Design a protein around this ligand. Sequence first.
Ligand SMILES: [Mg+2]
Length: 299
Amino acid sequence: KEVVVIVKWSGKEYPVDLTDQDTVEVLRHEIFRKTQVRPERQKLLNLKYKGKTAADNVKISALELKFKLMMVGSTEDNIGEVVDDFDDADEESVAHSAVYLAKVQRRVRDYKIKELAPPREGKKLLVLDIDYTLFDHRSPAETGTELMRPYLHEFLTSAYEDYDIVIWSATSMRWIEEKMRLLGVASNDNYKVMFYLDSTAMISVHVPERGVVDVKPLGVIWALYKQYNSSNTIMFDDIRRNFLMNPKSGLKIRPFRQAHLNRGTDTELLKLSDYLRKIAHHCPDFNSLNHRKWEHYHP
Ligand SMILES: [Mg+2]
């Protein structure tokens, strides 16, 4: 079951953890997770299946034994994501399969959370994406103030009244730390962020009809911090795919693009602060909500 593939890239070795039932496609996604080289940019030099380049659908099981996999490829400020053109808006699931649960458990076992501030009794949990969620990561700008989504700090202060806050970005931890300083979130007098999660906490899951997708599994947090669960957790992300393994707990935020043109009109965070306050005060079980209809929630 448990398998380790050693990948050699750019003069370094990267031990990749997976199982023998994972496919080459999953391997590519785990390689991306380790190296920041995208799956489509990876040339896997010495991975043959019956004398030929193993296809993405080949299970790891069906081949080798100690071995070092040579990968040639490049990783690009073109960081993060801007859209998912294959977003399925139909209102599941492998989100309840053994394979998925085991993937969460491995993150729970191996990923080391660095607590920046402690949980507070009775609070809900808010998880926040960064790119296009809290700021415009695609525009050039001389200051962070210019790229910041309007009402960011007022939104975080309001949320913090009722929610402990976690930041989860599909990027390196370094990028997160840098942007949180740039945006003034890192050290604010009016709120605290509990911890940050990065792309290494994410998992790659095959979703039939769709292929392998990388998601942000709230189950990792829920396993480690048992005071939170789906009944009191909500996540904001502009990319719906990120909550494919916990669809009821995600709210797809409108992306904040081209700050220079839209900074004067964007008020999504103001509106969403109202939403968060209302559900924290009026909804004892968030699973009863339809977040797609958040703008019409008036208890
Ligand atoms: Mg984003």
